Write a protein that binds this ligand. Structure first.
Ligand code: FMN
Ligand code: SF4
Ligand code: SF4
Ligand code: SF4
Ligand code: FES
Ligand code: FES
Ligand code: K
Lengths: 44, 213, 263, 431
């Protein structure tokens, strides 16, 4: 049933110091293989 | 507010710093977000990670990130000094950041700033003797319609009055974690006094789609 | 075959694709004003002293970095170009210190000379000036960093020519400071060359400090014998005394650098 | 043809979760129409997607207002060996502007879906989203939405079952307003100082990691999927000509109800304040001036606010600009000189310091304006200050130099009597 009266963005009240980088770490499995420039760095 | 470094007993290249075993896995995911051969793109997220582990960036912390990413230390020093969210001196457990730019200034952020000083006894830029709080002014934090506002660590506390901010400091002094968001009668960025838009139920999948997909 | 056609003050000139507006002006004998640009360093485009009007374009372009397009008429002496130079020179001198009498650069300073030739003749700055603390980078280069105009020549030379990544900028805005951040000596074998490429008296020679002035030196063009490279040099003398050693441009040997021992 | 614009209906609003009263996660967003027939959109090709954006009349929502379809077609070329990227500008730094924040935290799946559709139109292999570091909780919401899209096959390998591969990356800033500039954003992602690059080269040729790149605003990216689903012609039926579509507005300052609201382009500024923000504090007649599109735009006095429309062309003729459409309202009790001086102080604190006219000029204008606030100047300094701002404007690497000159010029243009009066007060107090 429709309810426009409540705030439904309450999850972030419980985010922590490492929340963002923990998500980035879980996402690392779904990424595609990164492209390569052919060298380890511009200084190689 | 000095952009040169002089070694001191608590801030020198031999000052002990290293990432935790858990934070080395986080670094690996950060590095993989960028193309091979451009690992230097990870300088900002990795310095920020070291700040989250340590609370601030000693010269040894900058030297460690430079080594791990095989970047010249100077290029790490440039990033640390350029970006204002990097703390090159220790700050209190709670880093209070009051916005004083014009939209917030028009809603009397001076009163909010004055209240924090009166309650904590410190001035702008100072840390309390117990090292619990640090106070600074900052530029617009992108919460202009919810002014006056402050950011304490990663949380925005919005629509503040002198009483509201004083309570927040009290809750923090007791170890509690106050709820972020507006302290007025609203939830986020909506008009106070009832919505002037978005009062119908949203249309579901397929509404108004042109023919031919 | 590939050469395109452009115009400098209405005079036709043929240049290769990729030639900059500054280089096209070079062909007809015009030298655009500059501070950050150095032809042996990477392009920076930050001093804004090379701004030049392109006919029919409302915005002036940075000649040192903008590549010329076919049919452009570069107006090197237009009222718009002249006002751009005056405005930029005005900003450069706003916080610059009144150091010329005590500054070793005086008399051979690109800031002095381009202020005479392209800037205004007076000031309307009525505030207090920036003051910057000095930095030690060894016994050879003295630093008076209040004179720095943030051209970044030294940073680029150290990274590209000397292959040393110790210099850089810290902070931002008016408080942006060229330096090393930590206490460090820039002791390359090519270190002394940053004195030459620094357009102002921010970097100067400690051994040479205060001993002479440019107009009074006699220039003897000679050769270096500190090694077998045969670097071409200028021996500055005065009243029968050797005062300093300077590089002499030779494309096929030392270009415009010399080693520290040679210097 | 339409003649009066405003009164946008709820059925024609794109960001239908602007206030967060509904579930922001995938389940809620899908039920509201997000991620619907995205596969069908992708398989229609980049030329078709670029055609719908071109017809929609969409213009950049980040502040400059370049025609979006024309800009995105710069990347519609064959690969020359390098990867191609889309960079979504979520820096959201312009004072007064807080619209991009609500999209990221309440409508994250429109941004993620816009990245895929917009990324397809450009042939981009991935999207990097640059969100300012202060938006930690909003960045965390965005990551959760991205993980949901990955775990449902909407993005990543074979996105939406389309045969197209797409990754969405979130990179956080570290506190710098300049990093919202498109080339300064790229330099920051690459790990350097947030210092803008000169142009040429243009980002569509040499961009992030030296690869073809397009920088687009959050609102620009987050409306493209709806433009494709509902057709660009529907989007073009709003606003005036060359000012098409719906637009998010931030009304802050001296209004009864500061708020963020969606509304039609070319809505009268008076109607927007009265209908949605509850009017000017103390009645409309208490209005002094309005900064209509963020701190970078010049202010306009009450006599110009009566009839001015809120669109790119209407505000340009009022000698200002729509910018980010962030309305800052100053009632008659504002010290107008101090308010503008605090903006110049902000630009002084935000200049990257790279190029001379801004590194030195902006700081110079800050010192002059600090004296103007107290009256500690001569009237002849007003024309000097105007001329100084004209030396900064149009002579800098990026537009932050222009954005610092314009608010000064807006003040001198409409409030010189207040400047001269204050100097005369100071002179008599010290005689
Ligand atoms: C100082 C400065 C700050 C800027 N900040 C932002 C910003 O925070 N968000 C944004 O979308 N564009 C910002 N811009 C504009 C961008 O440079 C660029 O025009 C825009 O991201 C292009 O996207 P669009 O075409 O969708 O508008 C800024 C520009 C300048 C000069
Ligand atoms: S660098 Fe040039 S302008 Fe500056 S003090 Fe020295 S001689 Fe004078
Ligand atoms: S020290 Fe000299 S060369 Fe280096 S940035 Fe300053 S003015 Fe340029
Ligand atoms: S105008 Fe200002 S912010 Fe932009 S590049 Fe120049 S110094 Fe940096
Ligand atoms: S002016 Fe304070 S959040 Fe924008
Ligand atoms: S010589 Fe072109 S900007 Fe410096
Ligand atoms: K020198």
């Amino acid at each position: 049933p429709f309810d426009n009266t409540t705030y439904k963005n309450l999850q972030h009240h419980d985010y922590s110091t490492y929340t963002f980088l923990d998500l980035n770490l879980d996402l690392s499995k779904f990424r595609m293989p990164q492209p390569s420039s052919g060298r380890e760095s511009p200084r190689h | 507010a000095l952009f040169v470094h002089r070694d001191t007993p608590e801030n020198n290249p031999e000052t002990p710093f290293d990432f935790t075993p858990e934070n080395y896995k986080r670094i690996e995911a950060i590095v993989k977000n960028y193309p091979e051969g451009h690992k230097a793109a990870a300088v900002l997220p990795v310095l920020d990670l070291a700040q989250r582990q340590n609370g601030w960036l000693p010269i040894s912390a900058m030297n460690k990130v430079a080594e791990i990413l095989q970047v010249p230390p100077m290029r790490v020093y440039e990033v640390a000094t350029f970006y204002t969210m990097y703390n090159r001196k220790p700050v209190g457990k709670y880093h209070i950041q009051v916005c004083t730019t014009t939209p917030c200034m028009l809603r009397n952020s001076d009163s909010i700033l004055e209240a924090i000083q009166k309650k904590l006894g410190i001035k702008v830029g100072e840390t309390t003797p117990d090292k619990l709080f640090t106070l600074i002014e900052v530029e617009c934090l992108g919460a202009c319609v919810n002014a006056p506002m402050v950011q304490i660590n990663d949380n925005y506390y919005e629509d503040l009055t002198p009483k509201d901010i004083e309570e927040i400091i009290d809750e923090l002094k007791a170890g509690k974690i106050p709820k972020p968001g507006p302290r007025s009668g609203r939830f986020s960025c909506e008009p106070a006094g009832g919505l002037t838009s978005l009062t119908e139920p949203p249309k579901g999948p397929g509404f108004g789609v042109q023919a031919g997909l | 075959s590939n050469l395109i056609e452009v115009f400098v003050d209405g005079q036709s000139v043929m240049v290769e694709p990729g030639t900059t507006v500054l280089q096209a002006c070079e062909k007809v004998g015009m030298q655009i004003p500059r501070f950050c640009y150095h032809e042996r360093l990477s392009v920076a485009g930050n001093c804004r002293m090379c701004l030049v009007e392109i006919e029919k374009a409302p915005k002036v372009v940075a000649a040192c970095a903008m590549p010329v397009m076919k049919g452009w008429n570069i107006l090197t002496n237009s009222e718009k170009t002249k006002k751009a130079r005056e405005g930029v020179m005005e900003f450069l001198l706003a916080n610059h210190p009144l150091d010329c009498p005590i500054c070793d650069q005086g008399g051979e300073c690109d800031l002095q000379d381009q202020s005479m030739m392209f800037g205004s003749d007076r000031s309307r700055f009525l505030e207090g000036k920036r003051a910057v603390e000095d930095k030690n980078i060894g016994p050879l280069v003295k630093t008076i960093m209040t004179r720095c105009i943030q051209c970044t020549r030294c940073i680029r030379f150290a990274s590209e020519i000397a292959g040393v990544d110790d210099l850089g900028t810290t902070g931002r805005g008016n408080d942006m400071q060229v330096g090393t951040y930590i206490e460090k000596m820039f002791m390359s074998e090519l270190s002394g060359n940053i004195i030459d490429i620094c357009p102002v008296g921010a970097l100067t020679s400690k051994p040479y400090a205060f001993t002479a002035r440019p107009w009074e030196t006699r220039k003897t063009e000679s050769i270096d014998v500190m090694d077998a490279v045969g670097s071409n040099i200028v021996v500055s003398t005065r009243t029968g005394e050797v005062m300093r050693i300077l590089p002499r441009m030779h494309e096929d040997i030392n270009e415009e650098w010399i080693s520290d021992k040679t210097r | 043809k339409k003649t009066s614009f405003g009164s946008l209906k709820d059925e024609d609003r794109i960001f239908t979760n602007l206030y967060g009263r509904h579930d922001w996660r995938l389940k809620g967003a899908q039920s509201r129409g997000d991620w619907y027939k995205t596969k069908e959109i992708l398989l229609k090709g980049p030329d078709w997607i670029l055609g719908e954006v071109k017809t929609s009349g969409l213009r950049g929502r980040g502040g400059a207002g370049f025609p979006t379809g024309l800009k995105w077609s710069f990347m519609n070329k064959p690969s020359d060996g390098r990867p191609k990227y889309l960079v979504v500008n979520a820096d959201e730094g312009e004072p007064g502007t807080c619209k991009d924040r609500e999209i990221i935290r309440h409508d994250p799946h429109k941004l993620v879906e816009g990245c895929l559709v917009g990324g397809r139109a450009m042939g981009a292999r991935a999207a990097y989203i640059y969100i300012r570091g202060e938006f930690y909780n909003e960045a965390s919401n965005l990551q959760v939405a991205i993980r949901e899209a990955y775990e449902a096959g909407l993005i990543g390998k074979n996105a939406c079952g389309s045969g197209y591969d797409f990754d969405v990356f979130v990179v956080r800033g570290a506190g710098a307003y300049i990093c919202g500039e498109e080339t300064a954003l790229i330099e920051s992602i690459e790990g350097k100082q947030g210092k803008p690059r000169l142009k040429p080269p243009f980002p569509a040729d040499v961009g992030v990691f030296g690869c073809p790149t397009t920088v687009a605003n959050v609102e620009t990216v987050a409306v493209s999927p709806t433009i494709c689903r509902r057709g660009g012609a529907w989007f073009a039926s709003f606003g005036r000509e060359r000012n098409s579509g719906t637009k998010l507005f931030n009304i802050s300052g001296h209004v009864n109800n500061p708020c963020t609201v969606e509304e039609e382009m070319s809505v009268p500024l008076k109607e927007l304040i009265e209908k949605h923000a509850g009017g000017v504090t103390g009645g409309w007649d208490n209005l002094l001036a309005v900064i209509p599109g963020g701190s970078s735009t010049p202010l306009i006095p009450k006599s110009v606010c009566e009839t001015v429309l809120m669109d790119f062309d209407a505000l340009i003729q009022a000698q200002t600009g729509l910018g980010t459409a962030a309305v800052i309202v100053m009632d008659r009790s504002t010290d107008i000189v101090k308010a503008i001086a605090r903006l110049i102080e902000f630009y002084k604190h935000e200049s990257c310091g790279q190029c001379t006219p801004c590194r030195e000029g902006v700081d110079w204008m800050n010192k002059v304006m600090a004296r103007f606030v107290r009256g500690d100047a001569r009237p002849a300094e007003i024309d000097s200050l105007w001329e100084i701002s004209k030396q900064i404007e149009g002579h800098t690497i990026c537009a932050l130099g222009d954005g610092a000159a314009w608010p000064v010029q807006g003040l001198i243009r409409h409030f010189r009597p207040e400047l001269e009066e204050r100097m005369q007060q100071f002179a008599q107090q010290h005689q």
